[PDB]
Amino acid sequence: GPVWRKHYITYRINNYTPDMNREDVDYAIRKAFQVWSNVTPLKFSKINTGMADILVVFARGAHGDDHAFDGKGGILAHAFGPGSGIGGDAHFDEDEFWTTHSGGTNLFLTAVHEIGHSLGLGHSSDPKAVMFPTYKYVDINTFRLSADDIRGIQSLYG
Numbered sequence: 001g002p003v004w005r006k007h008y009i010t011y012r013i014n015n016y017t018p019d020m021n022r023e024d025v026d027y028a029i030r031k032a033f034q035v036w037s038n039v040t041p042l043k044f045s046k047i048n049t050g051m052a053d054i055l056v057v058f059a060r061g062a063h064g065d066d067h068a069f070d071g072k073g074g075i076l077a078h079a080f081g082p083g084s085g086i087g088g089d090a091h092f093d094e095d096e097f098w099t100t101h102s103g104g105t106n107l108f109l110t111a112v113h114e115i116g117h118s119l120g121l122g123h124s125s126d127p128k129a130v131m132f133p134t135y136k137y138v139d140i141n142t143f144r145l146s147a148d149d150i151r152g153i154q155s156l157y158g
């Protein structure tokens, strides 16, 4: 399947959810990228203008792609595998309530999973994997990838 064929990857935050402090959105997304750069040769840079490899978007309902969102609950986010254009992009449902903690839906934890997709990972059948298709809050301060996640990503990079 598609992978990025270069080590320096850019991302851009298209718009910010009103659910969170701006700096907290920046940090959650940065930390989520760091999870993957920790176990690959990839380096991620936030850019403020221009065309990024990975565009991070908050949107609700129909938002121009073919994966319309569904209101509060259900689908929380979706992302596209590596490629030109929309490839790599990660979309977060604004009808969720995004947070830094265990309330609402945790942006960091959701973003770790979405960026996994942005890098070319699919879903895991292992409930312990961040790439498992079901969202479940785990303590974000001690968060770690499962062996399955690490095997998955290192089958694609490094």
Ligand SMILES: O=NC(=O)CNS(=O)(=O)c1ccccc1
Residues within 6 Å of the ligand: 074, 075, 076, 077, 078, 079, 110, 113, 114, 117, 132, 133, 134, 135, 136
């Ligand atoms: O990547 N998106 C999905 O897998 C769709 N399911 S979900 O939005 O409920 C979701 C999102 C993120 C992590 C687990 C599950």
Ligand SMILES: [Ca+2]
Residues within 6 Å of the ligand: 069, 070, 071, 072, 073, 074, 075, 076, 093, 095, 096
């Ligand atoms: Ca939803």
Ligand SMILES: [Ca+2]
Residues within 6 Å of the ligand: 052, 053, 054, 055, 083, 084, 085, 086, 087, 088, 089
């Ligand atoms: Ca893109």
Ligand SMILES: [Ca+2]
Residues within 6 Å of the ligand: 017, 018, 019, 093, 094, 095, 096, 097, 098
């Ligand atoms: Ca919201």
Ligand SMILES: [Zn+2]
Residues within 6 Å of the ligand: 063, 065, 067, 068, 078, 091
């Ligand atoms: Zn979308």
Ligand SMILES: [Zn+2]
Residues within 6 Å of the ligand: 113, 117, 123, 133
């Ligand atoms: Zn997913």
